[model samples]
Target: SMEQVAMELRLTELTRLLRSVLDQLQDKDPARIFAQPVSLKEVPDYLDHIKHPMDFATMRKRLEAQGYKNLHEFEEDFDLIIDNCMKYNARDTVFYRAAVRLRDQGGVVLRQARREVDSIG
Candidate 1:
């Protein structure tokens, strides 16, 4: 339960970092990574669904349904999220790592989503 809570916190951090990055990327190519936006609160199943294989695509769509259309933007923000998350979550490496890894993977998928969407457009 604690792990789950920590994960959601990391997820929240990731989302904030993602938004910051997205704000920057929006200037690069709004249609590229900012066409669709993914919000932190939009992410569902913060713990129950972000594990095992770390499938980000599924999670992306899940978030997308909730108004998160920018997985690529989320990916770009991963580095900062990792840095802060590792710092705050150091007390529990296992849970922290697991949560960060999963969050980072989801970010990657968000990156791929932009690629996929860009190519199609």
Candidate 2:
């Protein structure tokens, strides 16, 4: 239990650092990803706020407009962001930790092979 407690404390610290970075990046998160207190004993529901979100209807409103070619490319760029956070020693947010799942679930889907579906007659 002690280890878990320690991990939570670190996660809370990490989220605080990410909030600071988010503000610095001037990224407007109207949904308030970091608005909740990480100290709240349970896993925050919005912890994975930016983990692998890429809904393109409003892709034009994101912090950037770089359309990734594949999961590898997306991971490479996101890794860069996470790397910078680690460099500053603040890299344990759920979003940072969920990179793999993000790739498997949505990343690959977005960069899927351009194949057509034929109807079964």
Candidate 3:
């Protein structure tokens, strides 16, 4: 059970890193549009365009549930949030620009976490 305890410690560290990365994203988004799910009523065709919709709220829930098996999985969901926004909104729109900015900033945050975790091994 030493191995089991080691696995638990790793997961707890990963969760903390993910939480910090998410908080940074929230701080960067002043409008808070990415804070929750996109309302289908507001954008009726949203579901039609974006195949896998993701938001901070959903990610938060997943984080608490330990739904992610690794950092790469967490990154996938983070990328989905940005990718969905970019796919749904035109390049000229505010949402599209926000996604672009977040993508760049989030990359740095994620990379830092990766290094932090990877160094443990």
By lDDT, is 2 or 3 better? 3
lDDT values, one for every candidate: 0.44, 0.36, 0.85
- TM-score winner between candidates 1 and 2: 1
lDDT of 3 by residue, 51-103 (tens): 89899999999998877778889889988989889888899999999999998
lDDT of 2 by residue, 67-104 (tens): 43222443354344434333322347654344333334
What ranking emerges by TM-score with the best candidate at the front?
A: 3, 1, 2
Please give the TM-score that candidate 1 achieves against the real structure. 0.31
RMSD of each: 17.1, 19.7, 1.5
**Candidate 3, superposed: residue stretches over 4 Å from native:** none
Which candidate leads in lDDT? Answer: 3
The lDDT, on a scale of 0 to 1, for candidate 1 is 0.44
Backbone N/Cα/C clashes per model: 5, 0, 0
Give TM-scores for every candidate, taking all chains together and pairing residue i with residue i.
0.31, 0.26, 0.90
lDDT agreement of model 3 with the native: 0.85
Cα error, residue 69 of model 1, in Å, equals: 4.5
Candidate 3 lDDT score at position 66: 70
Q: Is candidate 1 or candidate 3 better by TM-score?
A: 3
After superposing all C-alphas onto the true structure, candidate 3 shows an RMSD in angstroms of: 1.5
